[PDB]
From a paper:
We thereby obtained a structure of primed actomyosin at 4.4 Å global resolution, which reveals how the myosin motor interacts with F-actin in its primed state to initiate force generation. The central actomyosin interface is formed between two neighbouring actin subunits and the myosin helix–loop–helix (HLH) motif, with additional interactions between actin and myosin loop 2 and myosin loop 3 completing the interface. The interactions between the HLH and actin and those between loop 3 and actin are the same as observed for the strong-binding states, largely conserved across myosin classes in higher eukaryotes. Thus, the orientation of the primed motor domain when docked onto actin resembles that of strongly bound states except that the U50 does not interact with actin in primed actomyosin. The converter is in a primed position within the motor domain, and the orientation of the motor domain on actin results in the emerging lever helix pointing along the actin axis towards the pointed end, at an angle of about 52° to the actin axis. In the bound state, with myosin anchored to actin through the HLH, the rest of the L50 moves downwards, relative to the actin axis, so that the U50 domain is rotated circumferentially around F-actin towards the converter, which lifts the HCM loop and loop 4 further away from the actin surface. Consequently, in the primed actomyosin model, refined with MD in ISOLDE28, the ADP is placed further back into the pocket, towards helix D, creating strain that may promote Pi dissociation from the ADP moiety as the Pi is anchored by interactions with the P-loop (S165), helix F (K169) and switch 1 (N214 and S218).
Here, to address these issues, we performed time-resolved cryogenic electron microscopy (cryo-EM)4 of a myosin-5 mutant having slow hydrolysis product release.
Residue numbers in the entry:
A (entry chain C), C (entry chain D): 5 to 375
B (entry chain B): 2 to 376
D (entry chain A): 2 to 593, 598, 628 to 774
Amino acid sequence: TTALVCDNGSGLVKAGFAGDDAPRAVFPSIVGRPRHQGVMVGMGQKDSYVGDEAQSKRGILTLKYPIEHGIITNWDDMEKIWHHTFYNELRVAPEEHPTLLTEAPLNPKANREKMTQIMFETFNVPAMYVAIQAVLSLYASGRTTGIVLDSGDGVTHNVPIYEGYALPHAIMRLDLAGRDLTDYLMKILTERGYSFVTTAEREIVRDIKEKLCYVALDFENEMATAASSSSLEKSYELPDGQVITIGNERFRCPETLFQPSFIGMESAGIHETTYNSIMKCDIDIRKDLYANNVMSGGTTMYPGIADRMQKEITALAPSTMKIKIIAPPERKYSVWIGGSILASLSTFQQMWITKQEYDEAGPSIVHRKCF
Amino acid sequence: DEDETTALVCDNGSGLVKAGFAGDDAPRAVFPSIVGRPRHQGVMVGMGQKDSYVGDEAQSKRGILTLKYPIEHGIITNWDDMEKIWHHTFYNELRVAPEEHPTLLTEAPLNPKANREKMTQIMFETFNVPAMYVAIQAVLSLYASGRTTGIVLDSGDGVTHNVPIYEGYALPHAIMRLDLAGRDLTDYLMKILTERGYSFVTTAEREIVRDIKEKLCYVALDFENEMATAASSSSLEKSYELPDGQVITIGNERFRCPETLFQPSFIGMESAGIHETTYNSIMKCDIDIRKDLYANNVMSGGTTMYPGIADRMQKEITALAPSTMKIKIIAPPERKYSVWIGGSILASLSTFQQMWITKQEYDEAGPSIVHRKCF
Amino acid sequence: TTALVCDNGSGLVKAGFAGDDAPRAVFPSIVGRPRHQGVMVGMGQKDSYVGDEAQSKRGILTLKYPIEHGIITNWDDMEKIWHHTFYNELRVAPEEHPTLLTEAPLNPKANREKMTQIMFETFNVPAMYVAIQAVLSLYASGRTTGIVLDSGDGVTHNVPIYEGYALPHAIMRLDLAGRDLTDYLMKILTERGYSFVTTAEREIVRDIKEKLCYVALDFENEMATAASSSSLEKSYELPDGQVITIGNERFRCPETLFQPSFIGMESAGIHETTYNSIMKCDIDIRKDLYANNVMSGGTTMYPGIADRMQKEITALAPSTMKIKIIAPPERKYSVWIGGSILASLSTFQQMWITKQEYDEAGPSIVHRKCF
Amino acid sequence: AASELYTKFARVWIPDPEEVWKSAELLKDYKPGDKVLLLHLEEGKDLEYRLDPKTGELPHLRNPDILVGENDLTALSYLHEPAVLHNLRVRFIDSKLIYTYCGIVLVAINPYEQLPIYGEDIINAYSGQNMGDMDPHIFAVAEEAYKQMARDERNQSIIVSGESGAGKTVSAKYAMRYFATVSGSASEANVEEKVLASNPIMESIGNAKTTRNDNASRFGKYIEIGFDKRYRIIGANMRTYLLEKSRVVFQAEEERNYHIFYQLCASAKLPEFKMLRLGNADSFHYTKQGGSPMIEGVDDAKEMAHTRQACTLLGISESYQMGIFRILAGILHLGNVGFASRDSDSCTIPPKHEPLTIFCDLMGVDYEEMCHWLCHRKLATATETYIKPISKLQATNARDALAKHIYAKLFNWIVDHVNQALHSAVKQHSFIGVLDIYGFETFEINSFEQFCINYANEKLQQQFNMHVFKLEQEEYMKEQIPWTLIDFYDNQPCINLIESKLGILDLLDEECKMPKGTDDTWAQKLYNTHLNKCALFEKPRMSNKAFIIKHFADKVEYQCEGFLEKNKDTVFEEQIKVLKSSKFKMLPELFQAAKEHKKTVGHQFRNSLHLLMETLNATTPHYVRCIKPNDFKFPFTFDEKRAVQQLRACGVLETIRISAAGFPSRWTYQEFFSRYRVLMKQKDVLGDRKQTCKNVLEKLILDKDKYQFGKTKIFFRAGQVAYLEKLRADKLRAACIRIQ
Ligand SMILES: Nc1ncnc2c1ncn2[C@@H]1O[C@H](COP(=O)(O)OP(=O)(O)O)[C@@H](O)[C@H]1O
Ligand SMILES: Nc1ncnc2c1ncn2[C@@H]1O[C@H](COP(=O)(O)OP(=O)(O)O)[C@@H](O)[C@H]1O
Ligand SMILES: Nc1ncnc2c1ncn2[C@@H]1O[C@H](COP(=O)(O)OP(=O)(O)O)[C@@H](O)[C@H]1O
Ligand SMILES: Nc1ncnc2c1ncn2[C@@H]1O[C@H](COP(=O)(O)OP(=O)(O)O)[C@@H](O)[C@H]1O
Ligand SMILES: [Mg+2]
Ligand SMILES: [Mg+2]
Ligand SMILES: [Mg+2]
Ligand SMILES: [Mg+2]
């Protein structure tokens, strides 16, 4: 049977068959709920909407995320998303296809047990396995040694790996992710007078962010260039047909990854976390991690993030170390691909907790199998 | 002092401007920001209709002229009319020379850089002010409260804002501006009086509805209880005498109108209620300081002058927060007049006399000096 | 004149006069520093806060330790701690009161020299002495023979002593200390859904650690009790009044001392190091060390550590050897008490390095005198 | 050149560890470059004294024994510290001459004894003199000021400047007595009798026992003695100043309160005081803390009889006296009202308390209402006057704030009453102003009052350092007359630290204005502002609530505790309401009287002081510097360390230096041309009046060292103006006889 693979994404869910190089399904995790009143008697009106059919009704609906900070916010809405892929999108049955799931490291034990309980009972899946999102993108990098930095919409984590063996004292996690960069963009656009208040506008700001924002090679140089030349200033057309101006915001927004003091965090910048994790690794494997830094996730997709990261790490590390940054053409599309690769292996077919195993051994079996 | 003339304190109120001298206990001047323009027709042979009227002169001519606000949503709508107000302030009410005296202005946080740079440019170029400072309204309300720690909710006519303050420090992530303010409550009262049968259609009538609002409206302790009481007893129903000498009835509109602060769904907003924004900002603050903000909630600005609002705020925050926390709501008398008083307290300090952007600093450094001194 | 005695404590500094029953001063060494922006005009503010004045402004300031791994991190910050001690807390001049200091063995020569250079110049002390922290707590214990295990916040060390004569080929020093147990607690609480990121939260976790954690007599039995009966589960209210649950973490965190592999540390457990140091001693004195094990320092203050240590050493040692674990009241202050006793001896006042000795003979006189 | 004088047998001044300076007869002649100097000390011992090898600089040379003990230190051949200290030392110990001159300054020494020299034939001795015709005395200073008024119509002032025990109080009294007795030829003797009789009243209500002076004068008093065109006294205006308020409530174990309270206690045996039911001095807080209700060598009942006679001489009715006495007994009865804490922020008083019973009875006030306002307070909000209970500490503060206020109200009444009794004509021709003020003060604790009185002395020394030195040298430079610039202590900085926009009292007023201003926070604000910069101010190492400032005399450490509250000086309205409601008639009169500035003590006082110093500087000034010889208060006991410190704090050495340089008299060329035209010959006068003045002064004074010339002025030494006036009188007389 075609083993199904699914990346549970904080802002964007992806799913498909094992062996495919690309997910068959890719849609927003955000759901929708109407407001105002009943337009007419009946009229095919729904009490809830999912993904693109919620995005087409922005401002009529209130948008809700089933995931925040890597963990599930509402299990009914996550069950709604799972069902939408299985029957409405992929048009298959979970009770016929083994389904691989994946989550962030240092995720609560209760989050995983409840996730597996729903999948094994509500969807009666025949077999199931839970992967860590960071190891899958390193499998797509096709290397056994490499420090992977994975930054999504809702969570961020850095994982040093050597010969296929992670270091559980040196692995890290960061509260800062792409959602906070969107909230920051709204505040720095408010400094011009552009005040936003609804989730309908937040999605247009999230687009503006992905279209126009970039990472500075030297923050001061870009700040002086914006003030002196004004050449970094651009325009953008909103859905009502009005234009708005944007320029300083393009570099200030992504600089938060390196300066979390912008949003008031005491936390260190992404470059520091990767460097400190190498310093927490054994001195013999440090060089090989320096030659194998791996960017992953949608937030790492940013113009100039790799040149700045190389510069920032070269400034901290010894001058004899060959600092190398691997930045896959698609960093968001890498965790799913690793899952599709992993699920295709004949040797991995034993690592699939079965329905019978789960029912006999109880929910804690998933943590005994993974660890 | 003896050897030194005053500095001038002025609050830029959206419906009501207040000004006076540093160290006075109340503003020597308080008048509507409203500017009026003749919307009538030819009547007198020697018609002395002043092109424009200001404050009281405009209020005494409601229906003969139209009423324009120089401020909407915390920001300036027309700078010529704001220059006209500043003129009336220092050349009629206080009747001074602004050329000789330092002047303090004040505005809402999260305000456009342009709305502040243009404000300082006009005051230095057209009023030759020797030195000036731009304060945040919320910090002046906290100074009048007389504490170093408190979460201040400041709701005016044209804007509402919420800034939690711990010790001599601010938290930039917990600042929360709100689009809902006392003007929207007036427009909502007109809608629910229209639902009864009283249709109002002009700024001259809107000012009578704003009076009715401030005289008769109150905040419910439990909305449902007040809805049931109004329907069952009719005891909340009262009468009001309009300027033509006719009477109108009002009762359910007394609690439905202020309830919009706790239920913005009344006007169609997705936005959270005033209690929710204050609570969420405490949860965005550090855990060690949440308790001291929970015991120091501070009400400020003219939209807080509603009967029952402090007791309701307490109940609402006590329902959200852990029951072990001592929820306290500070509501000082004259909440609308607390920002000015705080500006007067600040301006009375001698170590603050050097914190003013001077005419020489402006000329040499250009308008961005205000965002390099105050900001 | 009276002498002063001072314990340079990694996480807690203590000071007082010679011959007193307890230190006059005991406060955190953590030096605070503003990381927030001010808004009140006219407030008594400083660029650096100390001890309880840093703790009373948590979150608003960032907390920095002047000591890590028993070695000074910043000399200016340690100079500000000595300043606060002499003029703000003790209210007496060092220029008149001789000041005994104390540090961990296997500490760099430069750490001792720069410490004594600062004291002899900036504080113009007349006389000074540098003791080893381990011998002082054995003096408080009142024995000439014993194996002292001293575990602080920032360093752990082990010293077999016979008839007042340490065995320098047998002495040990474990990097693992009470700070790592706090970092471990934060990681094992994140699995229960309790994520922490700032030094302000780390101090609340430290309080939770000292209040609720205990050492297991049999680790497996406590895991089985937590899973089967759950009676080990307690609760804790936070500064903001919200409650949190804690149970398995109460025995998992102190168990790291016996199993450093818990985070991923390839060193032997505390019992193994004490046993190996007895094996590095001559057989004739081993029996007397086996009956004179001495617990010392704030990390040994865990409920159930003495009986477990007795069990673990009885399993390693010959069955004929009488295994005894001495674990007095006020174990973290025993080092200070030993220093006071030393500085009161009429036959020790000739061992103090004088300001003259330092000036004429240069900074290395400290090593020549102490050793 | 001076190196030639250090020959064999040349007594000098070697620095002494204990005696400050020791004399040494040279045993050898200093050879050019003799860094070693064999000398012989007066103890009979030889020494090889050594010089500074960077300079070869020699010790101060001793004046010849013939010049020792002179009437003015300018008469010495050598002008230095050892000389001026030694001359004052031998005079006080041997000659008993407590008075010596330093040019314009008269130096005055406390003998700790009556020397009852004074008498009518001494008034006759100084009558008709010129200065220097008779010896140094406050009587000559008073006679000279009187002459200066009588000859030129100018206004005058007498300024005292001494330590808290240096004769400055009674020296000013004897000088005032001089004016009163010289004017005693007039038939209005009772006006001068009232001027004298005002002082024992002011002493009883304003002087008290300190560890420094047993009759320390705790307020200041400038008097303005007015005179007519016959130069006879018409009366005197009193202008009193700041009076201590903590003296009324707190007394140190070695100090006392204002004497009036202890005089009242001694008087309690008479039926008029048995009516006020007055207790003994151990019954009241405001009398008992001093521990000694009687001073040695006095009787408080004798002093009470004196004050009652002085009131009768001032025309103050026994009824007014009895009214003030009832009020003073009322202050004592309030000072021991009982308080019993409740809750924590609450406190009740006994409805049977006897002191409280006689208190409300003597004021004629409702017990219940007095109690209500002593247990509860009114909120400052104008829209809702809601009540708030007060703690035992706040209720104790309300007792003491009320007692302080009532004392002010009655002191201000007395000084207004004496000014009505000392009535004078609507315009005076000319006036002389004697001034007396509290002196420099230190104790083991120093507070806002010490800060104020030391700043007042700082301002007095400042004006002196200007008129005598700074302004004088500027006059010379402006008139372009050959002159050498003078060195002096500029204490104007010790003033800019207090007066300027970031200064101590301005920051004290800010932390009074701010509701979160508080003790540590102000002290820390000073630390944040001034330790980083200024020379004069420091923090002590160990003390963390204290600060130390250098003054003209010496450094004084003020404690930050008790600063903001004494600067605020607030009083409970709820208590002033019931006092204004008193059925006793006196108390309602005492409690009855487009922008504003609200004023603290620090503001109010600095203004009062600027006004005073401007009205002094408008006159022609005279300066006496008072010196204390031993803290032991032992009679005729001269301590060298004590005196050398006092004379360097005043700057006596530099005053002698500038008065030895001479040339204080000045006349414009045209003024000399008009005044001494009778001395000018019709062939010697020219169209250039400058040359005319030069041509005649060349003939009139042969000694070229006594006169100088300026751009538009002519300069002259002491006494030379009196010689020119004697020539003017004699020549006018001869001319009148010649044309007869
Ligand atoms: N080109 C881009 N530029 C900036 N941000 C991007 C870009 N592509 C994706 N992102 C951000 O990455 C997140 C979504 O990427 P993805 O890794 O697929 O999310 P998820 O965590 O839901 O799987 C959002 O925060 C989005 O704004
Ligand atoms: N007693 C009251 N009842 C109701 N609304 C009030 C009352 N007092 C003031 N307001 C409202 O508050 C606003 C004016 O108060 P103020 O704080 O001075 O506003 P601003 O400073 O923004 O001009 C107006 O919307 C006015 O209607
Ligand atoms: N009663 C206790 N229970 C558990 N841990 C404790 C206890 N007392 C101290 N600790 C821990 O031990 C360390 C304190 O050791 P201490 O002797 O104070 O070291 P130092 O004096 O070198 O700073 C810290 O990690 C602290 O959290
Ligand atoms: N010439 C003098 N004749 C008599 N007594 C004198 C004389 N000079 C000083 N005294 C005495 O000196 C003492 C102190 O004088 P006083 O004026 O009180 O000092 P001060 O005001 O400087 O503290 C008094 O007892 C006073 O009688
Ligand atoms: Mg992802
Ligand atoms: Mg307002
Ligand atoms: Mg220790
Ligand atoms: Mg005196």
